[PDB]
Enzyme design. Sequence first.
Site, PDB file in Angstrom:
ATOM      1  N   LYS A  55       0.796  -1.264  -0.010  1.00 44.06           N
ATOM      2  CA  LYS A  55       0.019  -0.174  -0.085  1.00 44.06           C
ATOM      3  C   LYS A  55       0.776   1.240  -0.084  1.00 44.06           C
TER       4      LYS A  55
ATOM      5  N   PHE B 269      13.235  -5.141   3.076  1.00 49.20           N
ATOM      6  CA  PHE B 269      14.337  -5.811   3.534  1.00 49.20           C
ATOM      7  C   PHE B 269      13.762  -6.721   4.832  1.00 49.20           C
ATOM      8  CE2 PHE B 269      17.016  -4.595   7.504  1.00 49.20           C
ATOM      9  CZ  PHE B 269      17.577  -5.582   7.516  1.00 49.20           C
TER      10      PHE B 269
ATOM     11  N   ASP C 149      11.794 -11.733   6.962  1.00 53.39           N
ATOM     12  CA  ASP C 149      10.920 -12.221   8.087  1.00 53.39           C
ATOM     13  C   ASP C 149      10.173 -13.464   7.511  1.00 53.39           C
ATOM     14  OD1 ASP C 149      11.580 -10.435   9.788  1.00 53.39           O
ATOM     15  OD2 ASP C 149       9.765  -9.227   9.770  1.00 53.39           O
TER      16      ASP C 149
ATOM     17  N   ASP D 290       9.821 -17.315   9.123  1.00 53.04           N
ATOM     18  CA  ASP D 290       8.717 -17.804   9.711  1.00 53.04           C
ATOM     19  C   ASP D 290       8.075 -18.844   8.977  1.00 53.04           C
ATOM     20  OD1 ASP D 290       8.409 -15.245  11.114  1.00 53.04           O
ATOM     21  OD2 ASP D 290       6.776 -14.496   9.692  1.00 53.04           O
TER      22      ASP D 290
ATOM     23  N   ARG E 103       2.933 -13.604   0.407  1.00 49.57           N
ATOM     24  CA  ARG E 103       3.273 -12.146   0.957  1.00 49.57           C
ATOM     25  C   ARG E 103       2.595 -11.123  -0.202  1.00 49.57           C
ATOM     26  NH1 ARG E 103       4.401  -9.350   5.392  1.00 49.57           N
ATOM     27  NH2 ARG E 103       5.587 -10.684   5.869  1.00 49.57           N
TER      28      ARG E 103
ATOM     29  N   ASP F 108      10.517 -10.792  19.666  1.00 48.95           N
ATOM     30  CA  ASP F 108       9.411 -11.653  19.069  1.00 48.95           C
ATOM     31  C   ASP F 108       9.451 -12.968  19.093  1.00 48.95           C
ATOM     32  OD1 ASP F 108       6.744 -11.989  18.368  1.00 48.95           O
ATOM     33  OD2 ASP F 108       7.197 -11.418  16.347  1.00 48.95           O
TER      34      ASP F 108
ATOM     35  N   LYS G 269       9.774  -3.648  17.270  1.00 48.16           N
ATOM     36  CA  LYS G 269       9.437  -4.339  15.894  1.00 48.16           C
ATOM     37  C   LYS G 269       8.695  -3.605  14.737  1.00 48.16           C
ATOM     38  CE  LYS G 269       7.938  -8.340  13.439  1.00 48.16           C
ATOM     39  NZ  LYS G 269       7.618  -9.815  13.380  1.00 48.16           N
TER      40      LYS G 269
ATOM     41  N   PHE H 209      -2.137   0.791  16.049  1.00 43.96           N
ATOM     42  CA  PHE H 209      -2.211   0.126  14.646  1.00 43.96           C
ATOM     43  C   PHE H 209      -2.256  -1.457  14.794  1.00 43.96           C
ATOM     44  CE2 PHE H 209       0.088  -1.800  11.399  1.00 43.96           C
ATOM     45  CZ  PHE H 209      -0.414  -1.479  10.302  1.00 43.96           C
TER      46      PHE H 209
ATOM     47  N   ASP I 200      -4.729  -4.274  14.051  1.00 41.85           N
ATOM     48  CA  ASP I 200      -4.307  -5.399  13.170  1.00 41.85           C
ATOM     49  C   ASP I 200      -4.410  -6.796  13.630  1.00 41.85           C
ATOM     50  OD1 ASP I 200      -3.025  -5.994  10.558  1.00 41.85           O
ATOM     51  OD2 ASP I 200      -1.164  -6.338  11.732  1.00 41.85           O
ATOM     52  N   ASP I 201      -4.083  -6.897  14.865  1.00 43.85           N
ATOM     53  CA  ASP I 201      -4.366  -8.317  15.688  1.00 43.85           C
ATOM     54  C   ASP I 201      -5.754  -8.778  15.685  1.00 43.85           C
ATOM     55  OD1 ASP I 201      -1.699  -8.296  15.767  1.00 43.85           O
ATOM     56  OD2 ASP I 201      -1.602  -8.264  18.072  1.00 43.85           O
TER      57      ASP I 201
HETATM   58  C1  LIG Z   1       2.378   5.227   8.748  1.00 44.12           C
HETATM   59  C2  LIG Z   1       1.589   4.074   8.533  1.00 44.12           C
HETATM   60  C3  LIG Z   1       2.050   2.815   8.374  1.00 44.12           C
HETATM   61  C4  LIG Z   1       1.421   1.596   8.160  1.00 44.12           C
HETATM   62  C5  LIG Z   1       0.153   1.702   7.833  1.00 44.12           C
HETATM   63  C6  LIG Z   1      -0.553   0.647   7.282  1.00 44.12           C
HETATM   64  C7  LIG Z   1      -2.028   0.398   7.373  1.00 44.12           C
HETATM   65  C8  LIG Z   1      -2.478  -0.663   6.848  1.00 44.12           C
HETATM   66  C9  LIG Z   1      -3.907  -1.077   6.811  1.00 44.12           C
HETATM   67  N1  LIG Z   1      -4.820  -0.184   7.061  1.00 44.12           N
HETATM   68  C10 LIG Z   1      -6.067  -0.539   6.864  1.00 44.12           C
HETATM   69  C11 LIG Z   1      -7.061  -0.492   8.581  1.00 44.12           C
HETATM   70  C12 LIG Z   1      -6.234  -1.053   9.156  1.00 44.12           C
HETATM   71  C13 LIG Z   1      -5.699  -2.443   9.427  1.00 44.12           C
HETATM   72  C14 LIG Z   1      -5.023  -2.733  10.305  1.00 44.12           C
HETATM   73  C15 LIG Z   1      -4.574  -1.786  11.275  1.00 44.12           C
HETATM   74  C16 LIG Z   1      -5.148  -0.592  11.311  1.00 44.12           C
HETATM   75  F1  LIG Z   1      -4.876   0.244  12.337  1.00 44.12           F
HETATM   76  C17 LIG Z   1      -5.814  -0.205  10.064  1.00 44.12           C
HETATM   77  P1  LIG Z   1      -6.877   0.289   5.619  1.00 44.12           P
HETATM   78  O1  LIG Z   1      -6.093   1.501   5.278  1.00 44.12           O
HETATM   79  O2  LIG Z   1      -6.526  -0.713   4.145  1.00 44.12           O
HETATM   80  O3  LIG Z   1      -8.411   0.414   5.863  1.00 44.12           O
HETATM   81  N2  LIG Z   1      -4.087  -2.464   6.024  1.00 44.12           N
HETATM   82  C18 LIG Z   1      -3.167  -3.222   5.795  1.00 44.12           C
HETATM   83  N3  LIG Z   1      -1.750  -2.858   5.918  1.00 44.12           N
HETATM   84  C19 LIG Z   1      -1.566  -1.733   6.677  1.00 44.12           C
HETATM   85  S1  LIG Z   1      -0.011  -0.755   6.920  1.00 44.12           S
HETATM   86  C20 LIG Z   1      -0.619   2.950   7.677  1.00 44.12           C
HETATM   87  C21 LIG Z   1       0.195   4.046   8.215  1.00 44.12           C
HETATM   88 CL1  LIG Z   1      -0.513   5.727   8.052  1.00 44.12          CL
END
Ligand SMILES: Cc1ccc(-c2cc3c(N[C@@H](Cc4cccc(F)c4)P(=O)(O)O)ncnc3s2)cc1Cl
Lengths: 336, 336
Positions: A45, A86, A91, A95, A100, A162, A186, A225, A229-230
Amino acid sequence: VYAQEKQDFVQHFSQIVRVLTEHPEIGDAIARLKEVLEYNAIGGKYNRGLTVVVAFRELVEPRKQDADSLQRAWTVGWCVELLQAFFLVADDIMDSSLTRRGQICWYQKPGVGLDAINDANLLEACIYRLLKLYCREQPYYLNLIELFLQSSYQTEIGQTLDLLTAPNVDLVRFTEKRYKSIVKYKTAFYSFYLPIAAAMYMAGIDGEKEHANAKKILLEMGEFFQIQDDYLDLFGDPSVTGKIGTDIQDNKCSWLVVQCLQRATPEQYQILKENYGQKEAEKVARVKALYEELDLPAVFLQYEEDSYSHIMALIEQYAAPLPPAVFLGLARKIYK
Amino acid sequence: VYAQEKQDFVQHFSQIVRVLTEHPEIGDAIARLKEVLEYNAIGGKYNRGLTVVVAFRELVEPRKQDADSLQRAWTVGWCVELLQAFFLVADDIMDSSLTRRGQICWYQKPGVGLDAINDANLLEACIYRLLKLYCREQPYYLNLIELFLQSSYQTEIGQTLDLLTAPNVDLVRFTEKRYKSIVKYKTAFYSFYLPIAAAMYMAGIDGEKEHANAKKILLEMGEFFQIQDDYLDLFGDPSVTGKIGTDIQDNKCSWLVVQCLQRATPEQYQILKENYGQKEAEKVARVKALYEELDLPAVFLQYEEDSYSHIMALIEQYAAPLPPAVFLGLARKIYK
Ligand SMILES: Cc1ccc(-c2cc3c(N[C@@H](Cc4cccc(F)c4)P(=O)(O)O)ncnc3s2)cc1Cl
Ligand SMILES: Cc1ccc(-c2cc3c(N[C@@H](Cc4cccc(F)c4)P(=O)(O)O)ncnc3s2)cc1Cl
Ligand SMILES: Cc1ccc(-c2cc3c(N[C@@H](Cc4cccc(F)c4)P(=O)(O)O)ncnc3s2)cc1Cl
Ligand SMILES: Cc1ccc(-c2cc3c(N[C@@H](Cc4cccc(F)c4)P(=O)(O)O)ncnc3s2)cc1Cl
């Protein structure tokens, strides 16, 4: 902000690759490096890299934003994406992951295998090559080299913790203190602190106090976040997210199991000891339903509100003198 | 020089470890990092690290050699040893090696395995932590960070070329141009150029021309070292060296096979196609005896004299204004 700057960011990638993939007999290695860059730095993304670019625009008075300053912002964003790449390539080998970003992990490709260890080191190295090539004359050059090195180290040392924490289902390892520590090192440092901090330096904002203030807000956002995510790994609709979660199969120190273990009668500890980290689905079903039976969806909902109130106070308290929008734009990407 | 400075070098290691292995909940990771440092950075000959220290003494007017300057020399030598350690741990996982330095490779230890990928990244990271901690105020700080980063990249890109070159016995890949290119990038830059270049910077000698002149001599010495290393893999007495060689079992692009392939009638190409890269001993015996039957021991002897004459001319031509002894001390370690 991101919707409307993602375009020039991905198109920059092709230039990033040109300049890294220029000494006759090294050619074949350089072609391999190109194939590595292409497979692994593309198809996410780009939230982290783009955060660099967006924050650069918000931070620099717009009359210090020439073509070349912008190009350095694009480049440093791509550096953050390379650091991401990287870590992931490596990772995934550690794992034993299969896929991916919706594809075969690089290391699982035919005739790559463990050669991916070198490939991943090359991705890391490209970060500093780009920083040399585009930023060596800038007054923030050293600042950025140190930032990236420290981000690597934090992320590495978090990966160690971890790995120690989750080999074998020993749930005594899975504490709150330990969950938070793992997320900070991490994930949050590089995913949230790094990209804003880089934009800060690129703007001349090098103060220790300003960096500490931004860090305080941004590590806290990173903890939320990952926690979300979890949650979503398990309760997220898989067609809204993309992921379908194996947190529980993999014996992960997930915020879910942490909370669960805080909340369980001794009989429940057992049901979980008996189902956590299993292949078989019915034994993952009955972990879900045990989480459901402890209103973890609702604890999360409460946690999410509390967290949002907290982040807003942090921003009120610690954003100055940066524009609160730097932080709010990020908060809107994750609390949505 | 080395005989008589190895003592303070190895005793310094304990301080290196103290300062890297000092934030409650990260403790367990830090203990692991200590175990990684101890297993992998100790037990070699320390030629590369020590070269830093010896060259520092020869280069700095002895009235700019206080306790703290020396300590920085010890430290930067240990940085070179850490870079070595990072590459080896990772190379042993990639090649599937069993032993290293007379012990079980770190990755082969019970319950390490592929976690050694992170461990190796930590070793790399320690380099920059030490450089921060001991050299951040020095005027050569940036110079050294770039030196180490570039050395990593050169060594990585050389490892790629090597891996492409030798998966599968395709001997058409094994050319002279390609052998030399692999040695320069993978071995000579970090093993020979890096340690002297570091001492140079620490002394204030930062000129591009001085570095190019030293590089020219030192890359050439590195090519000889590896060439002699490949000879000895096979013809070295194993109780004088330590190694017993599997170059031929492993389908290595060894200087031996390169020369052999330059010298073979088409019938001989076949004997080699049939024996190169095999497990079975009799088929490694008959590679040895084919090398013996082409007087490769003698071509090597000729090569070794030619090479020595060349290095001496290089030193005569390009040492100035550094003391020729900087280079001669190294030449005496390898032409012995
Ligand atoms: C600084 C920064 C670093 C990583 C992220 C990411 C957001 C994200 C993500 N966000 C979703 C929602 C979301 C998913 C997982 C945790 C979270 F807090 C929010 P979406 O924007 O696709 O609705 N989904 C899958 N991978 C990633 S990585 C977003 C930001 Cl703003
Ligand atoms: C900086 C910022 C952060 C969050 C928001 C909003 C998030 C949100 C929202 N987010 C989650 C639900 C939510 C529930 C409870 C508190 C909270 F902050 C958010 P989602 O619908 O992604 O599950 N839902 C409905 N309206 C809004 S408004 C808006 C802004 Cl400008
Ligand atoms: C700068 C520098 C970098 C690496 C070395 C090494 C020498 C060496 C080494 N040298 C032996 C001889 C030798 C072995 C292999 C190649 C060669 F050129 C010389 P010794 O000193 O043990 O007699 N043996 C095993 N490993 C190594 S690593 C030596 C120096 Cl001076
Ligand atoms: C800078 C320097 C480089 C090499 C030497 C010497 C190497 C050497 C020597 N080295 C090899 C043999 C050799 C054979 C032919 C040329 C040559 F330079 C070295 P080895 O005995 O390790 O097999 N043998 C006998 N005497 C000497 S004197 C001495 C010095 Cl001061």
